[PDB]
Amino acid sequence: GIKESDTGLAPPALWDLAADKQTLQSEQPLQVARCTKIINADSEDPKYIINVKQFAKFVVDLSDQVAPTDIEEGMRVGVDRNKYQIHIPLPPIADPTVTMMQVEEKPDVTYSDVGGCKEQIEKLREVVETPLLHPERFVNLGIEPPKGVLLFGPPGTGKTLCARAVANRTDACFIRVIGSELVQKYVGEGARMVRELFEMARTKKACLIFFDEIDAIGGARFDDGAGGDNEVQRTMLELINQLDGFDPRGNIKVLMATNRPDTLDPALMRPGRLDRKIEFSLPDLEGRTHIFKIHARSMSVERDIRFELLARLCPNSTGAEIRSVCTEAGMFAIRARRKIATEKDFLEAVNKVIKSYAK
Amino acid sequence: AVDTAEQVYISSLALLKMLKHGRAGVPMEVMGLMLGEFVDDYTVRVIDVFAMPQSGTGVSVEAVDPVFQAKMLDMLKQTGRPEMVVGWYHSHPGFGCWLSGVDINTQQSFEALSERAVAVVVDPIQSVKGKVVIDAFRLIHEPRQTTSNLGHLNKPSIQALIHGLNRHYYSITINYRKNELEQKMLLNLHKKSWMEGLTLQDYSEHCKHNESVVKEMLELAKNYNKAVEEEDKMTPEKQDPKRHLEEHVDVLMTSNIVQCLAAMLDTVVFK
Amino acid sequence: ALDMTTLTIMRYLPREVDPLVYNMSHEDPGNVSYSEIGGLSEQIRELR
Amino acid sequence: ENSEKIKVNKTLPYLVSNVIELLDVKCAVIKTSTRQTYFLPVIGLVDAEKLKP
Numbered sequence A: 001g002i003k004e005s006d007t008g009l010a011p012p013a014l015w016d017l018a019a020d021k022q023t024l025q026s027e028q029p030l031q032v033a034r035c036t037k038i039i040n041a042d043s044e045d046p047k048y049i050i051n052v053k054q055f056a057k058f059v060v061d062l063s064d065q066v067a068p069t070d071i072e073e074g075m076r077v078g079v080d081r082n083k084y085q086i087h088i089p090l091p092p093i094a095d096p097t098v099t100m101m102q103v104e105e106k107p108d109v110t111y112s113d114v115g116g117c118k119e120q121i122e123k124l125r126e127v128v129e130t131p132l133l134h135p136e137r138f139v140n141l142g143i144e145p146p147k148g149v150l151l152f153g154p155p156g157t158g159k160t161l162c163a164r165a166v167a168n169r170t171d172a173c174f175i176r177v178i179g180s181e182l183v184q185k186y187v188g189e190g191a192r193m194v195r196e197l198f199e200m201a202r203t204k205k206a207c208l209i210f211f212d213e214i215d216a217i218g219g220a221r222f223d224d225g226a227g228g229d230n231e232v233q234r235t236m237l238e239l240i241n242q243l244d245g246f247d248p249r250g251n252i253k254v255l256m257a258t259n260r261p262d263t264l265d266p267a268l269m270r271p272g273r274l275d276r277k278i279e280f281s282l283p284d285l286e287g288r289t290h291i292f293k294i295h296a297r298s299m300s301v302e303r304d305i306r307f308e309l310l311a312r313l314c315p316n317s318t319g320a321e322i323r324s325v326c327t328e329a330g331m332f333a334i335r336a337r338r339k340i341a342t343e344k345d346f347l348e349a350v351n352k353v354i355k356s357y358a359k
Numbered sequence B: 001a002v003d004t005a006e007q008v009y010i011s012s013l014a015l016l017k018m019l020k021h022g023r024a025g026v027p028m029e030v031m032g033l034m035l036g037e038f039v040d041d042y043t044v045r046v047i048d049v050f051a052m053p054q055s056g057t058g059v060s061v062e063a064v065d066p067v068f069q070a071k072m073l074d075m076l077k078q079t080g081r082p083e084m085v086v087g088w089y090h091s092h093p094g095f096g097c098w099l100s101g102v103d104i105n106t107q108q109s110f111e112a113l114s115e116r117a118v119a120v121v122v123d124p125i126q127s128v129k130g131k132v133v134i135d136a137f138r139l140i141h142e143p144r145q146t147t148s149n150l151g152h153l154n155k156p157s158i159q160a161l162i163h164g165l166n167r168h169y170y171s172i173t174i175n176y177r178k179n180e181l182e183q184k185m186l187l188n189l190h191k192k193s194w195m196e197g198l199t200l201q202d203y204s205e206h207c208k209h210n211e212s213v214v215k216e217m218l219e220l221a222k223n224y225n226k227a228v229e230e231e232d233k234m235t236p237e238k239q240d241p242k243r244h245l246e247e248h249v250d251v252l253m254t255s256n257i258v259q260c261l262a263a264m265l266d267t268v269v270f271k
Numbered sequence C: 001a002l003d004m005t006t007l008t009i010m011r012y013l014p015r016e017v018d019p020l021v022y023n024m025s026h027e028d029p030g031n032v033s034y035s036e037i038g039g040l041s042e043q044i045r046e047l048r
Numbered sequence D: 001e002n003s004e005k006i007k008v009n010k011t012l013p014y015l016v017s018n019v020i021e022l023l024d025v026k027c028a029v030i031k032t033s034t035r036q037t038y039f040l041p042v043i044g045l046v047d048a049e050k051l052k053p
C-alpha cells in the first residue's frame, strides 16, 4: 500500500458543509504589510503608506469598514490583493523580545522570601510600594510619589528576588532585563529596545520593570577604549538619559540592581533616574537562619532540623549558596535513594561548601 | 432549441476597433460594447463596435456610463445603426481569453439583461505579428450538441481551462463576416502600385546584396565538401551545406533576374 | 528608454543617473568674489 | 469635467517611488519602490517646482 507523507486532515463529521465552500468563494484573503505616515491632509481623507516587504511600498487608504480611530504608525495592517485598501489592523507581535524579559504577572515571591534583608525590602517599599498604594503623604507634603530605586549587595545573591516580592504585592506586571537583551549584532537598535520596552510596558495597565547588572548598563562613557565591543556607548545613555525619575515618570514603576555600584554613572545615581539607594551584605546570622526557615518549605525533610546551628556553621556566606545547599541535601537523599532528607544531609551539604569550597 | 455549440460572427469592421482600443489601453483592461443581433439560435453576428472611456473601477457593470451609451446608441441609431447591444468586450493584456471573478459577474448581468449576451476577450499585446487571440464566452453541461463544429476547435486552452467550464462558462467559435468588397479594399492597402513595382532598387546596393550571399556561398562550397566527404551513411543530423545552399540560391537568383528584367523593361519603355 | 508594450527603444537618454551627484552639483556657495578674499594674492592667483 | 475625470482617475491606492532628474527632450526619471525604473515623458499632476530629484 501507499504511505502517507504527514498530510493531516480531520474525519468527515468534522468539516465542510456549505459553510467552507461559501466562505472560500466569498471572502477575499488579506495580504499583510506594515503601515506608516498617515498622509492626513485634513483628517477626513487621510490616506497612509504601506510596505509589503521585499515587494513594494504604496500609498493606500482605508476600507470604510475600518476607521482612522484604529490606525497608527506601523500598526501591522492587512489589505486585499488588488486595491490594497486597509481592511484590518493586525494584532501586535511577540518578536520585540519583550516577551523574554516578561514575568507578566504577580511573581511567586512574597515579602518573607527575602533572606533576612526584610529591612532593605521594607525601605524599598517606602519608595515604590508606599508611593503607589499609600499616596496620602507625598504630594500633599510636597513631592509627587517616587517610583524607582537601586539595590546592591552580595555576589548575585537574592537581589533580583526582592523585586519579585514587591511586584507580587504591588499586583504589578513584571519585566526583568539584562544588558544582553539590549544588544544584537545589529547596532543602534539596542538603544531602541529600551524605548520599545517602556512603550510596551505603558501599553500594559501600568507595569514594573527591573534591571540587573546595571553597572554594565548604567556605567558611564569610556573614551580611552578606542573601539572594541563599543555598542555600550551607543545604547547605555538611551537608558540613562531617556530614563525618567520620580517627577518625569508616567504610570510606571522601575527598580535597579547590580553587585558593583562604584562604576555607576552619577546620572543614574542622581534623581530623574533613582529615588533611593539600598545596600546589602552577606546574610547575617538572623538572615542565614531565616533563609533555612524559608527553604524548610522547599523540600520534604525530617523537619526536626537545627537550622540555628547550620546558619552558624556557615561563616560569612551568601544565601544563594543556602538554596544550593538545600538542593544539595536533596542530592544527599538522591545518592542514598532516600525518600526524604534529614539533618545529617543538611549538615554535610552545608559542609559541601564550607569544607570543599573553603578548604 | 436551447443553444448549442453554435457560432459567432464578427465583422472585420468590428474587429479593428477591438484591437485599436486594446493597443490604446496597453496598461489597462479597457472595455467597450458591441452592436449586433441574435439573428438566430445557431449564430450571432456583430456589426460595429464602440469603445468607451476609462472608469476608475476598471472592468465592471459600473464601468458603463448609462448617459454616454444611451446617447451613443442614440447618435448611432440616428446615423443608421439601430442595432441593440448584443455583448460587451474588454482587454486582457498579458494573459489569454478567460473570465476573472469580476468578468463572470459582469457577464452574469448581461445574461440577466436580455437572454444570451456574449462577452469577448482581447489580449492586444500577444495579439501581434499576425497572431490574434480572441474568443467569446457565455455562462449558464452545454445543451445538446448537434454538429461536430465545436469538436473541430481546439479544446479550451489550459490558461483558460484553469478558469474554464468549472465556472460553468464555455467558448463560442469566432468567425468573420468579411466580404469581397472589404477583402479587396483591405488588400488594396498593400497592393503594389505601378511605379513601386517598377522600382529598380539600387545597383550599388544590389552588389552589396550579391556579395552578402556570394561570400557565404564560398563557405557553403567548402561546407559542401564536408557533407559529401562524410558519406559513411551515419545518423541524420539538411544542416550546414545542404539546405542553406538552396534557400540562398533562391533569393540570389530572383534578386538578379528581377533587377535585370525590370532594367531591361525600363530600357524598352522609355524611348 | 523603451516602450512598455514592445520594448523597442523609444529614446536614448543622457548617460547615467543619481540624486546624490545632483545634490553635489546643486548647492550654492553664495555670492563671493576674488576681491572678497583676504588678500591671499599669490595663493589666489596661483589657483587661477 | 476635466477636474472630475482627473479626480475619478486618481485611483486612490498608488505606488511610491524615488525621483530622478529631469530633461527637456520637462520629462523625468523615476525609480519604483519595487526597484523598477521608468521614464515619464510627462511628469503628471505635479508641476516642475514641487520636484526635487
Ligand SMILES: Nc1ncnc2c1ncn2[C@@H]1O[C@H](COP(=O)(O)OP(=O)(O)O)[C@@H](O)[C@H]1O
Residues within 6 Å of the ligand: A113, A114, A115, A116, A155, A156, A157, A158, A159, A160, A161, A212, A213, A257, A258, A259, A283, A291, A318, A319, A320, A321, A322, A323
Ligand atoms: N537569601 C535568598 N533568598 C531568596 N533568594 C535568593 C537568596 N539568595 C539568593 N537568591 C537567588 O538569587 C536569584 C536572583 O537574585 P540575584 O541574582 O541576587 O539578582 P542580581 O543579579 O541583581 O544580583 C534568585 O534566583 C534567588 O533564588
Ligand SMILES: [Zn+2]
Residues within 6 Å of the ligand: B029, B059, B090, B092, B099, B100, B102, B103
Ligand atoms: Zn476582465
